[PDB]
A paper describes a structure:
For the purpose of modeling dual-targeting concepts in immunocompetent mice, we applied and optimized controlled Fab-arm exchange (cFAE) for the efficient generation of surrogate murine bispecific antibodies (bsAbs). The recombination is driven by two matching point-mutations, F405L and K409R (EU-numbering), one in each parental IgG, that weaken the non-covalent CH3-CH3 interaction in the parental Abs enough to allow for the dissociation of half-molecules, but at the same time, strongly favor the heterodimerization that promotes bsAb yield and post-exchange stability upon re-oxidation. The mutational and structural analysis of the mouse CH3-CH3 interface suggested that the K409R mutation alone could not sufficiently destabilize the CH3-CH3 interaction to enable dissociation in the mmIgG1 and mmIgG2a backbones.
To determine the structural consequence of introducing the [name] mutation into the mmIgG2a CH3 domain, the crystal structure of the mmIgG2a-[name] Fc-region was determined. A network of conserved water molecules at the CH3-CH3 interface has previously been noted in high resolution crystal structures of the Fc-region of human IgG1 and IgG226. One water molecule, dubbed w2, is tetrahedrally coordinated by the side chains of T411, K409 and S364 from one CH3 domain and K370′ from the opposing CH3 domain, and the ability of R409 to displace this water, as observed in some human IgG4 CH3 domain-containing crystal structures, could contribute to the ability of IgG4 to undergo FAE26. Interestingly, the [name] mutation was observed to restore a w2 equivalent water molecule at the mmIgG2a CH3-CH3 interface coordinated by K409 and T364 from one domain and [name]’ from the other. Furthermore, water occupancy maps and side chain fluctuations obtained from 250 ns room temperature molecular dynamics simulations were highly similar for human IgG1 and mmIgG2a-[name] at the CH3-CH3 interface around positions F405 and K409 but differed from that for wild-type mmIgG2a. In particular, simulations indicated the presence of w2 at the interface of human IgG1 and mmIgG2a-[name] but not at the interface of wild-type mmIgG2a, consistent with the observations from crystal structures. Additionally, fluctuations of water-coordinating residues remained close to the crystal structure for human IgG1 and mmIgG2a-[name]; however, a significant shift of the K409 side chain away from the crystal structure position was observed in the simulation of wild-type mmIgG2a. Parallel to observations with a K370T mutation in human IgG4, the T370 present in most mouse backbones hypothetically alleviates the electrostatic clash with R409′ in the opposite CH3 domain, thus enhancing CH3-CH3 interface stability. In human IgG1 (and IgG2), a conserved water network is observed, wherein one specific water molecule is thought to shield electrostatic repulsion between K370 and K409′26.
Author numbering:
A (entry chain A): 237 to 443
B (entry chain B): 237 to 442
Amino acid sequence: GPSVFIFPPKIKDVLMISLSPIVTCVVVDVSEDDPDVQISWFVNNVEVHTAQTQTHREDYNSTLRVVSALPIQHQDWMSGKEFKCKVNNKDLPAPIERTISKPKGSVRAPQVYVLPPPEEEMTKKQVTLTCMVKDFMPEDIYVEWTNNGKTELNYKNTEPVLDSDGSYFMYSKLRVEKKNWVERNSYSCSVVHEGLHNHHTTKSFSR
Amino acid sequence: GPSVFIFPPKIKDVLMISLSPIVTCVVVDVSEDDPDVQISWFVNNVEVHTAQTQTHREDYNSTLRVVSALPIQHQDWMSGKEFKCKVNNKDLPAPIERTISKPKGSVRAPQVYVLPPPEEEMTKKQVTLTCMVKDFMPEDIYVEWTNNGKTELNYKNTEPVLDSDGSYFMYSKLRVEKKNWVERNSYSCSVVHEGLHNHHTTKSFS
Ligand SMILES: *[C@@H]1O[C@H](CO[C@@H]2O[C@@H](C)[C@@H](O)[C@@H](O)[C@@H]2O)[C@@H](O[C@@H]2O[C@H](CO)[C@@H](O[C@@H]3O[C@H](CO[C@H]4O[C@H](CO)[C@@H](O)[C@H](O)[C@@H]4O[C@@H]4O[C@H](CO)[C@@H](O[C@@H]5O[C@H](CO)[C@H](O)[C@H](O)[C@H]5O)[C@H](O)[C@H]4NC(C)=O)[C@@H](O)[C@H](O[C@H]4O[C@H](CO)[C@@H](O)[C@H](O)[C@@H]4O[C@@H]4O[C@H](CO)[C@@H](O)[C@H](O)[C@H]4NC(C)=O)[C@@H]3O)[C@H](O)[C@H]2NC(C)=O)[C@H](O)[C@H]1NC(C)=O
Ligand SMILES: *[C@@H]1O[C@H](CO[C@@H]2O[C@@H](C)[C@@H](O)[C@@H](O)[C@@H]2O)[C@@H](O[C@@H]2O[C@H](CO)[C@@H](O[C@@H]3O[C@H](CO[C@H]4O[C@H](CO)[C@@H](O)[C@H](O)[C@@H]4O[C@@H]4O[C@H](CO)[C@@H](O[C@@H]5O[C@H](CO)[C@H](O)[C@H](O)[C@H]5O)[C@H](O)[C@H]4NC(C)=O)[C@@H](O)[C@H](O[C@H]4O[C@H](CO)[C@@H](O)[C@H](O)[C@@H]4O[C@@H]4O[C@H](CO)[C@@H](O)[C@H](O)[C@H]4NC(C)=O)[C@@H]3O)[C@H](O)[C@H]2NC(C)=O)[C@H](O)[C@H]1NC(C)=O
């Protein structure tokens, strides 16, 4: 029969009041001969009727996939309410129910540092700027590099790693032209995390 | 019936000639009522007879698990030969065969840099050293920090990340006593990868 997966909102979406967090319930292995799936949503066991649901074909193996997106209030996530999807179908011996909520635990703001290129790289045409983000809990975080406020082109993030004390760390690596680095630059690391004031902080090499 | 999974050697083991790389074949859902499975191993379709096999109980669900560990020659893995386990038993309708080999692809040696602590930490008793390992392919790598050659305790590695040019990078973070680092400079980053000369390099602060 079908299988159901449940997915949280993106951390940036739930921490920035201007964005639209969504909880998503995905039904896979739905039969082409029985596409009708009934999906019911609950918030702390109260049924709600606001989800947007769409069906598509998975050509890889001739099955259907149903995607149900529930728009949520930021504060319902942050306050630890439980979101539940209940999936019914003729091809199921019982409804499938999946639940998700913001895990309850310690909160510690990240310490953010920007590191210059290693000295040995300074003979190269392109150099590497590193943003160290550490000591944070929970692991959910959003990190980007920006230049003059514009979300940067060539950076890449590591995933968070569990440190020896139970906090997490990650690094963000930015490649830049050495010319741009030595000349007046505004490269900045920007971090979104629930432990920060206004859920956001930036670090830069200069003002 | 049973299911068979096959696992590669650890990258450090297969790159270091002093270590012992192993290819492992795991049979799950063996019946406690019929524990006997026959496992045969082949390298480039040549049967080999050196594997060590054990059986044990999985009490979670009253099944057995059989683990067969083939000690391999490093060059067989590195040259792209296929390793095959073949699992049989009197009640299977046909044997189950699993194969594994080193993935094909390009090789790029890592560039390794050590980064000092952020200047903000330099007023603290403990500081953070960073080893930046980048531009490598394939993603299989081993990275550690050492202190006067002794493998260090308090470091943690990121996993590799796919970079914009199809190569990989990672970082390794080590916490040290500041006094000790500024005085003795005893900490170095050691990297084991296919692309390096002797499959190894070490990087120190200058
Ligand atoms: C038929 O084919 C399909 C398709 O196959 C795939 O695609 C084709 C083209 C081929 O390439 C093929 O090789 C591929 O496999 C098969 O469908 C797949 O079925 C398997 C199940 O068999 C599914 O596997 C689960 O995947 C989960 C992860 O899914 C995400 O990530 C993968 C990539 O890593 C994506 O492919 C998926 O689409 C998912 O992506 C996420 O989707 C979210 C929802 O949209 C996104 O979030 C939303 O994003 C929007 C913006 O877009 C907004 O931001 C919203 O706010 C937000 O909500 C999200 O961004 C996106 N992420 C990414 C990274 O892209 C796994 O989580 C899951 O693992 C769990 O379950 C396993 C049991 O099945 C178990 O073994 C695991 O241990 C794990 O168990 C859980 O563990 C946690 C703890 O960690 C516990 O809490 C739980 O208790 C426990 N739960 C359970 C249930 O056990 C599965 O591995 C796969 O998702 C699915 N793919 C697709 C595309 O649908 C199908 O099976 C084939 N059928 C047959 C019969 O062969
Ligand atoms: C009865 O219960 C048992 C036990 O259950 C478990 O334990 C209990 C207590 C509960 O906690 C329960 O929740 C647990 O599940 C059940 O047994 C399990 O059965 C499932 C299958 O149903 C097995 O799932 C596969 O797992 C593979 C990964 O296994 C490793 O990682 C897990 C942790 O994630 C470990 O638990 C395992 O033990 C494995 O660990 C590895 O073991 C290696 C061998 O020992 C180690 O390597 C060796 O290490 C030594 C040093 O120690 C040397 O270095 C050697 O050199 C070296 O070789 C290795 O270090 C170690 N790793 C880790 C991290 O520990 C998955 O890979 C596999 O996925 C494939 O197959 C799926 C289909 O089954 C498919 O959907 C997946 O997509 C995936 O498919 C593959 O995809 C790739 C591309 O992505 C393709 O290339 C392949 O073609 C494709 N393959 C296939 C076949 O399609 C499975 O998920 C599970 O391992 C097993 N657990 C154990 C412990 O045995 C049992 O099912 C129950 N029975 C019943 C009837 O209920």
